[PDB]
Each structure stands twice: as C-alpha cells, then as structure tokens.
Amino acid sequence: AVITGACERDLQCGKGTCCAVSLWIKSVRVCTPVGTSGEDCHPASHKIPFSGQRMHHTCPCAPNLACVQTSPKKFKCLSK
Numbered sequence: 024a025v026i027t028g029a030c031e032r033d034l035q036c037g038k039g040t041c042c043a044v045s046l047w048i049k050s051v052r053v054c055t056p057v058g059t060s061g062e063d064c065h066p067a068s069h070k071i072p073f074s075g076q077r078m079h080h081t082c083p084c085a086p087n088l089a090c091v092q093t094s095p096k097k098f099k100c101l102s103k
Contacts, residue, residue, distance in 0.1 A: 030054050033072040041071050041082035052077070057085040058100035064090035066098055 027035050029051065030042040036054035043055035057071070058064045058081065065081040068090060084090050084100035091101045 028054060032074040034074065038071060041068070042073065042077055043080050043082055044077055046080055055080070055082045057082050058088065058090065059085055060088060060100060060102060062100050064098045064100045066090050066092075 025035055030036055030053055033040070033042045036042065040054040040056050042052050045051035045053055058068070062084075063081060064084055065079045068079060068081045068083045069075075069077070070083060087102070088100045089103035090098045091103070092098045
C-alpha cells in the first residue's frame with residue numbers, strides 16, 4: 024500500500040531520504056538520500072518530511088552538514 028521508490032511526498036520514503044524530482048521527466052519523482060559530504064544541493068531543498076513538489080533533484084544535506092555555495096546556482100553539502 025505504501026508505494027515507495029517512486030514518490031510524491033517524502034513521507035512515503037522517510038527520514039534519510041527525500042522525494043526528489045526525476046532528471047528524465049518532471050512527471051516522475053523518486054526517493055533520493057539526504058545530501059552527503061560533497062554531493063550537490065540547492066538552498067531551497069526544504070526540510071524532511073515535505074509533502075509538496077520539491078521541484079529539484081536535490082535533497083537537504085544530512086543533519087551534520089550544510090548546503091554551501093560553490094559557484095553561481097551550484098551549492099554542495101559541506102561539513103558545518
């Protein structure tokens with residue numbers, strides 16, 4: 024019943040992942056892990072659990088990390 028892998032709300036995957044958009048068709052959204060050390064991020068990667076359309080392919084950085092800017096519109100999950 025709890026359809027997962029494919030996603031619409033973080034809730035159906037949970038703490039450790041977020042409901043990221045697909046790179047193939049915006050139509051599809053899937054579970055993606057919280058951003059780990061060095062992975063790309065977006066400053067608007069809203070907290071978990073988010074029930075809305077995340078819009079981005081990104082997930083918030085893991086608790087012991089923060090989404091810091093590296094270049095124009097390019098942020099990464101660094102240690103903070």
